[PDB]
Design a binder for this molecule. Structure first.
Ligand SMILES: C[S@@+](CC[C@H](N)C(=O)[O-])C[C@H]1O[C@@H](n2cnc3c(N)ncnc32)[C@H](O)[C@@H]1O
Lengths: 51, 262, 261, 51
């Protein structure tokens, strides 16, 4: 999850891919159902738990 | 040894300058004052030899002067420099903006005959212009710390974009610690109402720190500010109350008039 | 097509953000406005598909309103977006600080239903705080375009750091000339003398654009500004002339006393 | 050679710190001419653009 957020923050191609289908990109980068749900719902305090 | 203070900007991983990231990468030791946990994890992966300066803040509700905390942070940084380490301080945003520890450590390192410098970084102010699509140069710009604006005589130019920083703690003080946010912000509204109508649209801005998160850009009437939920990162943007008007006195001295402006 | 406007900062190669460099690298086409040939060479190695926006500034003896230069730059950028290109605009410093082209292109692109955004960069002001060892956050700060200061009714707060940008064209009304004259600067000094004494120490600041280069940090009395050698890249810093005074009216409402600060 | 050196010096913190310790030795080690080194040490930016 930390590795994904770092890559997404640094890589303009990944950032654009992510914007076009966040859930598909997050699945491809091996994020959990709970992690993806926490991201899509803006549950920042739940993202703490799962990091 | 040597000292370089760098900023990470606001956004995780991507907003640090190429050179500033290189300084962190090649450092013998890094002293960090980063928020988050994602920010701290990113830093530790880039260079594992990190000392977290956060340790020097009062813990367990102990009374601890900010002056004492900063002195302990600066002493920790200088101990590494003195020992001969290529020392880098990793700060949030711009290492010289709303930060005294970097300026203090650089002054003290130079005084002890060490190489020390600050690398500029992307500040919350830099993020605000980009996120809001506003140019400080369009009609000019004035920035004050919200408490300094309340405590001291600072009459704004209402043709400018006026920024009040640290709006969440506006008028906060040991004397006014039992006053409530709403009470202190209502006093600020009445102060600003000298120049800005109560229905004047203002903007509560919070720059995003994660790439999965959008910035806070909340447009509300000035009168509604005291009811607003504010964060330590919250900034108040007050757009102009007045259009620009010709400076006839200076235009006269230049021997021109409005119709002459290209 | 899409538009991303990025800043390259002031220093060659190293002052661009990691993400901003990534946008340039992955761009179909880059529109550039960079400080010098070293920066141009750096950009061309990153991405060979560069169009230099410098070409739209008045050249060989042509009289051209700077507004028409900016319009032609915006049109050139939008033509790439309209053609379906993943377009990046690379401007020196912060692309949205004392710069209208990026703001204009993003507005126009959004109006034509294209994805557009601006990435913040390191501005000349960001370099100034670092080089002068100033914390502007706590201290407060103000910025005006020098000419707008002269042509329109602006009031600075003389207790707070004052930056006048584009000082080298201060009072040049036509927008067809890229310098001003000592008589225009003398009129600006007289204007400033309302709040700032004639012997008030001001600083002509030029951030270094090359890594082998020291910044210009030239201290001089305000009175000598009209004799000073100014460059297009010159910014004027006017430190506070006036001591802070307590806001007794507001301190009273807060129930706090001066003694307490 | 001069442009390649300035680009690397601008973004490489190890090279920049080496350059601060011994500018002439670093410039020699990166293939700069005595003419180029003189222009750098005399801070003559106009002459550098030339060379
Ligand atoms: C069209 S604005 C471009 C500003 C740029 N977007 C930035 O972020 O700094 C040009 C003005 O920026 C300032 N400026 C540009 N380069 C500078 C430098 N190297 N040092 C100091 N000020 C500079 C000057 O006030 C100059 O007249």
């Amino acid at each position: 999850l930390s590795d994904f957020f770092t890559q997404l923050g640094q890589d303009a191609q990944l950032m654009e891919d992510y914007k076009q289908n966040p859930e598909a990109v997050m699945r491809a980068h091996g994020l959990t159902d709970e992690q993806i749900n926490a991201v899509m719902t803006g549950d920042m305090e739940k993202l703490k738990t799962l990091s | 040894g040597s000292l370089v203070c760098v900023g990470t900007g606001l956004q995780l991983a991507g907003q640090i300058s190429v050179l500033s990231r290189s300084y962190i990468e090649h450092a013998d030791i890094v002293f960090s004052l980063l928020p988050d946990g994602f920010s701290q994890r990113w830093l530790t992966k880039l260079n594992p030899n990190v000392i977290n300066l956060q340790q020097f803040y009062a813990q367990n509700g102990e009374v601890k002067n900010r002056r004492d905390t900063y002195e302990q942070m600066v002493n920790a940084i200088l101990d590494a420099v003195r020992a001969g380490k290529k020392t880098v301080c990793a700060l949030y945003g711009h290492p010289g903006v709303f930060a005294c520890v970097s300026h203090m450590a650089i002054t003290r390192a130079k005084a002890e005959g060490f190489s020390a410098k600050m690398e500029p970084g992307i500040s919350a102010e830099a993020c605000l212009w980009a996120d809001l699509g506003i140019d400080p140069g369009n009609s000019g710009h004035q920035s004050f710390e919200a408490s300094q604006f309340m405590f001291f005589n600072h009459v704004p130019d209402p043709t400018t974009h006026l920024l009040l920083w640290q709006i969440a703690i506006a008028g906060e003080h040991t004397l006014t610690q039992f006053h409530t946010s709403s009470d202190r912000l209502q006093i600020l509204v009445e102060q600003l109402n000298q120049w800005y109508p109560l229905d004047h649209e203002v903007v509560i801005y919070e720059a995003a720190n994660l790439p999965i998160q959008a910035p806070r850009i909340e447009r509300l009437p000035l009168a509604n500010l005291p009811q607003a939920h504010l964060m330590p990162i919250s900034t108040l943007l007050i757009p102009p109350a007045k259009k620009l008007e010709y400076n006839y006195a200076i235009l006269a001295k230049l021997g021109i008039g409005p119709e002459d402006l290209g």
